[PDB]
């Protein structure tokens, strides 16, 4: 199995990518305070492990605050936006 | 906030370390198939995010299998052992 450490946005997001039978392709990581735009290939399932994300999805008007334990889905071939206050850890699965 | 990518055991365990108000000092990471010995400073709380860990704690005879969603605690200044089958992601908090 391959594990790889990845960084994005000048080090404000860092993650470990992997692949397993139960998750498919996935990454766990952390984001620090900031505002981020992400683009998807495959649809993504995001789980907030600790902290919180303010989430703007392309097909719905309102931002929504996702605190620890919550799960959201992003469509494929899309753009979504996040806002982060305190360091926030997450699991992302590429569906 | 600081985020740092860490690797252990010749790259078989990789994690992102961070610190937040809700977690204290912590790391999220992934372990691949193998058998690992860890030593603690502070007590640690481990949450299995995906996959599974076979866990041997110093003060109890039996190994126990912790699958996704489960949480265990390791005392401070101790040694514990893990066995991993498929890539397994986790949250570790330094209590």
Tell me about this structure:
- With 95 residues, the first copy, chain A, is mainly β.
- Chain A has one domain.
- Helices cover 0% and strands 63% of the residues of chain A.
- The first copy, chain A, contains no helices and ten strands.
- Chain A has strands spanning 4-8, 13-20, 24-31, 34-39, 44-50, 52-56, 64-67, 71-74, 79-84, 88-94.
- A six-stranded antiparallel sheet of chain A has the order 1-2-3-10-5-8, with no helix packed on it.
- Chain A binds chain B through residues 1, 3-5, 7, 11-16, 18-23, 26, 28-30, 32-33, 47, 49-51, 68, 86-89, 91, and chain B through 1, 3-5, 7, 11-16, 18-23, 26, 28-30, 32-33, 47, 49-51, 68, 86-89, 91.
Tags for this model:
globular, dimeric, homodimer, 0% helix, 95 residues, nucleoside phosphorylase, 4-stranded antiparallel beta sheet, hydrolase, 63% strand, purine, 6-stranded antiparallel beta sheet, Pyrimidine/purine nucleoside phosphorylase, mainly beta
């Amino acid at each position: 199995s391959m594990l790889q450490s990845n960084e994005y946005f000048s080090g404000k997001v860092k993650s470990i990518g992997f692949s397993s039978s139960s998750t498919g392709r996935a990454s766990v990581g952390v984001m620090v305070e900031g505002e981020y735009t992400f683009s998807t290939a495959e649809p993504e399932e995001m789980t907030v492990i600790s902290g919180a994300l303010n989430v703007l999805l392309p097909d719905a008007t309102d931002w929504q605050v996702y605190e620890a334990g919550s799960v959201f889905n992003v469509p494929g071939h899309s753009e979504f936006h996040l806002q982060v206050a305190e360091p926030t850890s997450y699991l992302c699965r590429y569906l």
